[PDB]
Design an enzyme around this catalytic site. Structure first.
Site, short mmCIF file in Angstrom:
data_model
loop_
_atom_site.label_atom_id
_atom_site.label_comp_id
_atom_site.label_asym_id
_atom_site.label_seq_id
_atom_site.Cartn_x
_atom_site.Cartn_y
_atom_site.Cartn_z
N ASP A 187 90.14 -18.63 -69.78
CA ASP A 187 89.40 -19.42 -70.99
C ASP A 187 89.22 -20.84 -70.53
OD1 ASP A 187 92.39 -19.45 -71.31
OD2 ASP A 187 91.75 -20.41 -73.38
N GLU B 149 65.67 1.46 -40.91
CA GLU B 149 65.06 0.17 -41.53
C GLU B 149 64.88 0.30 -42.86
OE1 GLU B 149 62.01 2.27 -39.79
OE2 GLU B 149 63.37 2.44 -38.33
N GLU C 232 60.01 7.96 -43.26
CA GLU C 232 60.97 7.08 -43.62
C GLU C 232 60.67 6.02 -44.66
OE1 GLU C 232 62.37 5.03 -39.93
OE2 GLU C 232 64.19 4.83 -40.89
N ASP D 132 94.80 -14.12 -69.14
CA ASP D 132 95.37 -15.43 -69.62
C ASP D 132 95.49 -14.90 -71.07
OD1 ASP D 132 95.96 -18.20 -70.05
OD2 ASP D 132 94.18 -18.17 -71.49
N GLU E 33 63.42 13.54 -36.74
CA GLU E 33 62.41 12.58 -36.42
C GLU E 33 62.77 12.21 -34.89
OE1 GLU E 33 63.57 9.37 -39.01
OE2 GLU E 33 61.88 9.88 -40.45
#
EC number: 7.2.2.19
Lengths: 175, 986
Positions: free
Chosen positions: B679, B296, B773, B338, B748
């Protein structure tokens, strides 16, 4: 996902998770070593004995009488197993949660322990140890009853463990 | 590309349009046509994104992952509705948490983009403008939108071209097609047809182009959206964005996570069924396991990470319209740039001078970062005064503080360049032009265009009148005889005369425009001090004059450009110049900026040196090539791909905007990421098609700016370099962060697994997991984003989208398999210590949970034989959760330190130098300590104070993690091609 290399993965964990389980167990075993076989490191959790009952909500031994506490000595193995004393309108039996070396201190709502047993020495020390009626008029109704024990050593936690030194059951004999 | 009717006899043109060349159209018809089609104006941006756009931020690809995650949790909760469940604090909480993250992250990201748009809005300044039309013989100024097709229009100096017109007549008219076509210098316009392509022809004027000078009449060929710029504008909105490289990488990431999630969810589902758990339970376990696999917090940590980087870019004045757009630059293989406005300054200036039969280059740079020539010579002095004195150019009032080059000047193109040059090198022209009073001058004549002026003498030595004149080298060559050198005059000799001619052709061939400068002293005896000579008769001997020298000029690249291009090349990025300008100038600039390295010969260069037909030479021998747009029209896909593949340094000259698009597309055909920098409007179709467009804040036009994905407010080209660098470090750090968080999932998840398997009281609770967490790891997880370059990243090649992955098998192989495991064992060890100490030996804990979890059983025997009520033992379970929590933290310390570096040892980089990480562990430990010790904690969170000894149990495990990964970090450095790098190294 590889090929002809998985053997480098399988064999790896085999002797890696092995080293880890070996270390994990390694730590549990050292921990276990630093603890008495007769008594827990902390009694604090069980500090105040709770009271529980029967209603799901002797050969050898020694004869005794209602009297003061009896000391079997220290909690050691040098002496063999410490001897233990002998012992409609539902009937419920109450007992005091056994706690090592603990000596209890002692020396109208709707119509409706001997010290010679303590201190308890524990299972290892005392295996076959033995710890020590609502004929009410009313019926067909739910009655809330609270049976509790008193003493300086006993404390109640109304907000928490409703069992701590007390009971709380609703008997109803519908006839 | 477009087509036109430009080549037609005026009689034929008007015949088709049904209009009078001199009279124009009748009011009735004008009004009729205007009403027919539609007013002369482009249909407003067909995009009026409502505030509903906020929803956009909510979906995306990542937010979708959390969305489905939230939904899954909700469903799981719905399933547990089957019975009385604890989820009131568990699943519903999580599901809601997930939705909270997507919405909050969405709001943040949306606001950012919104703030940028607001800033953009501030820049819009609109003026309706007007056009001068001629109807029924009379000239009338009407609103430009009123202009229809086929009616005579008059353009003057300074007025904008209302709509596309077909010039019927003109007088010294020079329109500015700088933005539309890309043509640098003002292109003159005439009635005659010059070129086949309507863009280069003189007989057509274009919409949105300002007429610099002169006047001209024209029949309106196109009106409104049908105009050329309108066509380009429309096309610059039908292109698709394509998925960002970072976005796809995260897509792959979710696939991996989900993959692991489903595997375990399914495998365990079957396993659960084998044991005995009812289908209902088996299902809740399935949902539980899967949902548990979803990070999460990782969505927040990723969003913030990108935001932080983006913020830095903002500080650099580099704004990202999109949040994901930050990483892209670290993936660019080719840059189509360019020429004018982008690579160059787009401003003309004096290039070279000719004195003493020598060519001296001036400082062309805006910043004047170049080298100055030798001013000492007297010839230079004389030429300077002739250039300074003979001009209509003069600075406007207000340009004192401003730099002499950037400051505005009122005059002609050449005269402006000359004036600025004089003011810079020789000093101020003000006092100097004032020194010599101008009696009578002859502005450039319609023919021979010679411009002369005569002044009096300032010098005390000789009182003779001074005459000066400038003009085309050939015409002036005809009128000049004497030549000056080092301050002494001489007649003209063929040797030096030709030297002058060759010098002229040389500079002229260089692409610069040359102007002949000459002066002559007058025989004061013949012309007395009082004599007043007029323009009527030849008062001065036009011939026998003393020719001083020539002065050419050109426009240079910006100051930062050259070095920027070199860095892009060193980075391994291929630089391709795509310009619509002329090839002669295009190649020169290319060589100047470094697009075409020195020593690199084009196919022509080889043909030229060998003096062999150009067709003969084998293209393979030529590494560089200047491809003319003329050929580009004929070329096929295989042609383009060959050119692009076979030539390292390439320059597309005289290429139309559509062609720039095909070039970008052709580069994409290769399957490479393209970045375009432009440009003007000609770059609009290109910049939008490119993976990432880059416009110029000031030098850039509006259409191209709207098409650009990124804008440079400071107009610094070097930023591009910083950009490409800014994109690759963040990738590695993301790995760090992800790896860290992913490591926590093992310690966990395991507690709940074993709980189901061994039937032992739950080691870690739900609240606990959340504190790890969401509470603790958050700061350390963000701290890693601050990690610096492990090695010189700029040296390494660009990553391969296929091969290299943000989150790959190796990463999972260590976050989940190695480190994560060590942490898990640490947690359980802590668990057992507490339990064993309390009276419950580990061996007895098995199968205890059924009785343990039961609230009814007050008598539960431990190892000692003691009887525990429910609250009592549960208290132990909760005091058992806190320690597991703390344990995770302690293990996270080691994990954070090792997570800091991917290759290098803690020694080298020193994870300690990072201050934020330092404060990360101090705050983390402090918080953990607080949650355990705070007075009300056990009541609210069911977290109880931890006995001091407990803190130590997870210590040795943390050390193992560090020591283990460190050696791994050492072995990897020692054995590059080692087996560890292949497996470990992620």
């Amino acid at each position: 996902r590889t090929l002809s290399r998985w053997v480098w993965i399988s064999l790896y964990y085999v002797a890696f998770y092995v080293v880890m389980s070996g270390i994990f167990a390694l730590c549990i075993y050292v921990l276990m070593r630093t603890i008495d076989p007769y008594t827990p490191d902390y009694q604090d959790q069980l500090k105040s004995p709770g009271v529980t009952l029967r209603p799901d909500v002797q050969e050898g031994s020694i004869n005794c009488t209602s009297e003061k506490y009896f000391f079997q000595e220290s909690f050691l193995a040098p002496n063999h197993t410490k001897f233990s004393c002998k012992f409609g309108k539902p009937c419920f039996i109450i007992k005091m949660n056994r706690i090592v070396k603990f000596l209890p201190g002692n020396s109208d709502g709707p119509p409706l322990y001997s010290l010679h047993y303590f201190p308890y020495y524990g299972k290892k020390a005392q295996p076959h140890y033995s710890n020590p009626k609502l004929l009410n008029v009313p019926r067909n109704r739910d009655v809330v009853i609270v049976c509790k024990i008193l003493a300086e050593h006993v404390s109640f936690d109304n907000p928490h463990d409703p069992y701590e030194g007390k009971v709380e059951f609703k008997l109803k004999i519908q006839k | 590309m477009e087509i036109n009717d430009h080549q037609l006899s005026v009689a034929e043109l008007e015949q088709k349009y049904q209009t009078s060349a001199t009279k124009g159209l009748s009011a009735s018809l004008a009004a009729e046509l205007l009403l027919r089609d539609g007013p002369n104006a482009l249909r407003p941006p067909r995009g009026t994104p409502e505030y509903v756009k906020f929803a956009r931020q909510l979906a995306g690809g990542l937010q979708c992952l959390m969305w489905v995650a939230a939904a899954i949790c909700l469903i799981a909760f719905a399933i547990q509705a089957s019975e009385g469940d604890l989820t009131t604090d568990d699943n519903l909480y999580l599901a809601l948490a997930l939705i909270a993250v997507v919405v909050v992250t969405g709001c943040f990201g949306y606001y950012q983009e919104f703030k940028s748009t607001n800033i953009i809005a501030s820049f819009k300044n609109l003026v309706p403008q007007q056009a001068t039309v001629i109807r029924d013989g009379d000239k009338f100024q009407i609103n430009a939108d009123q202009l229809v097709v086929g009616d005579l229009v008059e353009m003057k100096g300074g007025d904008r071209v209302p709509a596309d017109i077909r010039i019927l007549q003109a007088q010294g008219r020079k329109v500015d097609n700088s933005s539309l076509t890309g043509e640098s210098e003002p292109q003159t316009r005439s009635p005659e047809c010059t070129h086949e392509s309507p863009l280069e022809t003189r007989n057509i004027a274009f919409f949105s182009t300002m007429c610099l000078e002169g006047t001209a009449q024209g029949l309106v060929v196109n009106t409104g959206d049908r105009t050329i710029i309108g066509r380009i504008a429309s096309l610059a909105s039908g292109v698709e964005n394509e998925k960002t490289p970072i976005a796809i990488e995260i897509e792959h990431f979710v696939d991996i996570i989900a993959g692991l999630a489903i595997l375990f969810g399914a495998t365990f589902f079957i396993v659960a069924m084998c044991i005995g758990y009812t289908f209902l339970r088996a299902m809740v376990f399935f949902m539980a396991i899967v949902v548990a696999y979803v990070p999460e917090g990782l969505l927040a940590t990723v969003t913030v990470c990108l935001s932080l980087t983006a913020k830095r870019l903002a500080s650099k004045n580099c704004v990202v319209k999109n949040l994901e757009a930050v990483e892209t630059l670290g993936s660019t293989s080719v840059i189509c740039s360019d020429k004018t406005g982008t690579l160059t300054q787009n401003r003309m200036t004096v290039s070279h001078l000719w004195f003493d039969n020598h060519i001296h280059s001036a400082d062309t740079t805006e910043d004047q970062s170049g080298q100055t020539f030798d001013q000492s010579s007297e010839t230079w002095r004389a030429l300077c005064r002739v250039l300074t004195l003979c001009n209509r150019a003069a600075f406007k009032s207000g340009q004192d503080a401003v730099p002499v080059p950037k400051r505005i000047v009122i005059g002609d193109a050449s005269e402006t360049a000359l004036l600025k040059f004089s003011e810079l090198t020789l000093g101020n022209a003000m006092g100097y032009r004032e020194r010599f009073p101008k009696v009578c001058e002859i502005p450039f004549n319609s023919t021979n265009k010679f411009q002369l002026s005569i002044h009096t003498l300032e010098d005390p030595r000789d009182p003779r009148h001074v005459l000066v004149m400038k003009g085309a080298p050939e015409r002036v060559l005809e009128r000049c005889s004497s030549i000056l050198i080092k301050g002494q005059e001489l007649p003209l000799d063929e040797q030096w005369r030709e030297a002058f001619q060759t010098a002229y052709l040389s500079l002229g061939g260089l692409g610069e425009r040359v102007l002949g400068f000459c002066q002559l002293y007058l025989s004061e005896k013949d012309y007395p001090p009082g004599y007043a000579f007029d323009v009527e008769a030849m008062n001065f001997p036009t011939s026998g004059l003393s020719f001083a020298g020539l002065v050419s000029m050109i426009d240079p690249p910006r100051a930062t450009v050259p070095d920027a291009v070199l860095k892009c090349r060193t980075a391994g990025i291929r630089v391709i110049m795509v310009t619509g300008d002329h090839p002669i100038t295009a190649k020169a600039i290319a060589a100047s900026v470094g697009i075409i390295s020195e020593g690199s010969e084009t196919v022509e260069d080889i043909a030229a040196r060998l003096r062999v037909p150009v067709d003969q030479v084998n293209r393979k021998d030529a590494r560089a090539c200047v491809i003319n747009g003329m050929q580009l029209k004929d070329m096929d896909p295989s042609e383009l791909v060959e050119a692009l593949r076979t030539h390292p340094e390439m320059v597309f000259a005289r290429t139309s905007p559509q062609q720039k698009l095909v070039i970008v597309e052709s580069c994409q055909r290769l399957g490479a990421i393209v970045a375009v920098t432009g440009d003007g409007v000609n770059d609009s179709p290109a910049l939008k098609k490119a993976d990432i467009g880059v416009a110029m804040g000031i030098a850039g036009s509006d259409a191209a700016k709207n098409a650009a994905d990124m804008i440079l407010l400071d107009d610094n080209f070097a930023s591009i370099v910083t950009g490409v660098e800014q994109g690759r470090l963040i990738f590695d750090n993301l790995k760090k962060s992800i790896a860290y968080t992913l490591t926590k999932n093992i310690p966990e998840l395991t507690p709940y697994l074993i709980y189901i398997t061994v039937s032992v009281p739950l080691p870690l609770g739900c609240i606990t997991i959340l504190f790890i967490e969401l509470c603790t790891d958050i700061f350390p997880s963000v701290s890693l984003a601050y990690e610096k370059a492990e090695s010189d990243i700029m040296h390494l090649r660009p990553r391969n989208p296929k091969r290299d992955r943000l989150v790959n098998e190796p990463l999972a192989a260590y976050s989940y398999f190695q480190i994560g495991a060590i942490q898990s064992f640490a947690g359980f060890t802590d668990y057992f210590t507490a339990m064993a100490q309390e009276g419950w030996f580990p061996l007895l804990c098995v199968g205890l949970r059924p009785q343990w979890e039961n609230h009814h059983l007050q008598d539960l025997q431990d190892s000692y034989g003691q009887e525990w009520t429910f609250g009592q033992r549960l208290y132990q379970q909760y005091t058992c959760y806190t320690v597991f929590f703390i344990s995770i933290e302690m293990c996270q310390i080691a994990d954070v330190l090792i997570r800091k570096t991917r290759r290098l040892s803690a020694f080298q980089q020193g994870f300690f130098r990072n201050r934020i990480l330092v404060i990360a562990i101090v705050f983390q430990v402090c918080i953990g300590c607080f949650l355990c010790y705070c007075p009300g904690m056990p009541n609210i969170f069911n977290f109880m104070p931890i006995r001091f000894q407990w803190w130590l149990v997870p210590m040795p495990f943390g050390l193992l993690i560090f020591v283990y990964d460190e050696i791994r970090k050492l072995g990897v450095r020692c054995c590059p091609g080692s087996w560890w790098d292949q497996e470990l190294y992620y």
